[PDB]
Amino acid sequence: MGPGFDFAQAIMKKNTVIARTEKGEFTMLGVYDRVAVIPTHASVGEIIYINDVETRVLDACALRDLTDTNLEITIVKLDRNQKFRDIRHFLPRCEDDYNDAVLSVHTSKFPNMYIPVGQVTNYGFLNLGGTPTHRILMYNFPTRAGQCGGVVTTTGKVIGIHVGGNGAQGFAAMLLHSYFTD
Ligand SMILES: COC(=O)[C@@H]1CC[C@H](C)N1C(C)=O
DSSP states (O other), X not given: OOHHHHHHHHHHHHHEEEEEETTEEEEEEEEEBTEEEEEGGGOOOSEEEETTEEEEEEEEEEEEOTTSOEXXXXXXXXXXXXXXXXXXXXXXXXXXXXEEEEEEEOSSSSTTEEEEEEEEEEEEEEEETTEEEXXXXXXXXXXXXXXXXXXXXXXXXXXXXXXXXXXSOEEEEEOOGGGGOO
C-alpha cells in the first residue's frame, strides 16, 4: 500500500522460502549464498524441507551472546542448488529502536501476509517460553501461531525475525550485520 510494504514485498519475493521441520512450517529468511535464518525453537536437524523439497543441512548454529544467553536465531547453511540475493547491506550494525515496521509471513497457512506493526522497542531481556533471551524487539500487535520466522522490516532495513508473542505484544530476535560476516 506504501513504501514500507514495497520494501517488505521485495524481501519476501526474492529472499524467503517455506521451511518445514518436525516442529512445523516457518517463514525462513535467506541472507546470502545458501545461508538462511530460522527461530531456534524450529529445532533444525540434519534434514529440512525447503518449499516441500528434502534438503540436507550442511551447518546449523544456534546463536548465543557472549554471556551464553539464548538469542533464538539459528543460522542454517542449506545444500541447495541456488544462492539467495545477498541482502547483508540491509542489516543493522547496532541494537536500536525503529518506527513504522512491517511483519511479513509466507507459509501454507498464511500466504502473502503483511502486518503494519508500528513502533518497535529495543526490549532486551525476555523470558521466552521459559528460556532467558536477549536482543528482543517488541511491537504492540497481537501476533498468533503461524507467524514465527516472519520478517520484520522498515524502509531500507531487515531488522529481525518473529519468535513469539503474549497475546497483546509480538517479539522478534534482532538480526545484526556481524552475525553474517564470512
Ligand atoms: C529489498 O528492497 C529492494 O530491493 C530495494 C532496496 C531499496 C528500495 C526500498 N528497494 C525496493 C523497494 O526495490
